[PDB]
Design an enzyme around this catalytic site. Sequence first.
Site, short mmCIF file in Angstrom:
data_model
loop_
_atom_site.label_atom_id
_atom_site.label_comp_id
_atom_site.label_asym_id
_atom_site.label_seq_id
_atom_site.Cartn_x
_atom_site.Cartn_y
_atom_site.Cartn_z
N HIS A 60 65.09 19.61 70.44
CA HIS A 60 66.01 20.18 69.43
C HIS A 60 65.19 21.15 68.60
O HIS A 60 65.81 21.98 67.88
CB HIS A 60 66.84 19.17 68.63
CG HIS A 60 66.14 17.97 68.12
ND1 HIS A 60 65.94 16.80 68.80
CD2 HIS A 60 65.49 17.83 66.94
CE1 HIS A 60 65.24 15.99 68.08
NE2 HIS A 60 64.98 16.60 66.87
N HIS A 90 58.60 21.55 60.99
CA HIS A 90 59.39 22.10 62.12
C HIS A 90 60.26 23.21 61.59
O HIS A 90 60.40 23.43 60.34
CB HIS A 90 60.26 21.03 62.83
CG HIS A 90 61.26 20.47 61.91
ND1 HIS A 90 61.05 19.32 61.27
CD2 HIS A 90 62.46 20.93 61.56
CE1 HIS A 90 62.11 19.03 60.43
NE2 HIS A 90 62.99 20.05 60.66
N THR A 194 68.92 16.73 58.31
CA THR A 194 69.88 17.68 58.84
C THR A 194 70.20 17.51 60.35
O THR A 194 71.05 18.24 60.92
CB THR A 194 69.40 19.13 58.48
OG1 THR A 194 68.16 19.31 59.30
CG2 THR A 194 69.18 19.35 57.01
ZN ZN Z 1 64.98 20.39 59.80
#
Ligand code: ZN
EC number: 4.2.1.1
Length: 255
Positions: A60, A90, A194
């Site tokens: 992801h 990230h 998130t």
């Molecule tokens: Zn994030």
Amino acid sequence: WGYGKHNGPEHWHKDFPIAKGERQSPVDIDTHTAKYDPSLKPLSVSYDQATSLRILNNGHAFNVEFDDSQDKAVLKGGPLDGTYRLIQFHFHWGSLDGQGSEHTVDKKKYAAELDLVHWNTKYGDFGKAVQQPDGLAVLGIFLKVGSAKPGLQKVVDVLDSIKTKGKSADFTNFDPRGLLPESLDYWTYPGSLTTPPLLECVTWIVLKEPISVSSEQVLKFRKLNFNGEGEPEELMVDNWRPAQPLKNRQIKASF
Ligand SMILES: [Zn+2]
């Protein structure tokens, strides 16, 4: 779960009901409604002693992991209470330079967003922390496209090695200090992760001042794959979630 038409953010609530809770992230920072709070202390970023370990493609995004067995890379001050240790960092980027960031400012979308994740040492480990309202502290920094960022090139250059889902590469001696903007002026509010499990355990700290990356830098990001090696190719782009309702919550500014 993912970011396509069939497992995208609009679908997350089926498996992750907190998807429509009261303190979901990201959100749109309305700068005229944000509240200037004089009682907010300056941020305290201590990363000189940081130990990076590896970089991995989790399917992801790509995460840069750090050794959090000791207080080597810590965040404190601001709206925080106690010491928060860096675990990983990230990004979230788009297919175009016109979108990417998760958090938006006055509805403005940036090219990408860098999130430094830290957890409260009073809870012992990361896993206990995600079970807590003041469990995590995420430092958000927007990236805009202009000039290159020397500090980010080490990361760019190693992406070729972790093209597909599950791949990792040793990634030592990487200094996060090279990604910080000049100013540490910020906005803060109570939110969540998130990406699933969207646990509402985060104290968000969004930096006002964006960092610039060159077009080519960003380009290398768009060459990642969502898919595992040997499967049809799904370019890793638009791995960002849409702004959620503020719902009562107040956004405070340190400036
Ligand atoms: Zn994030």
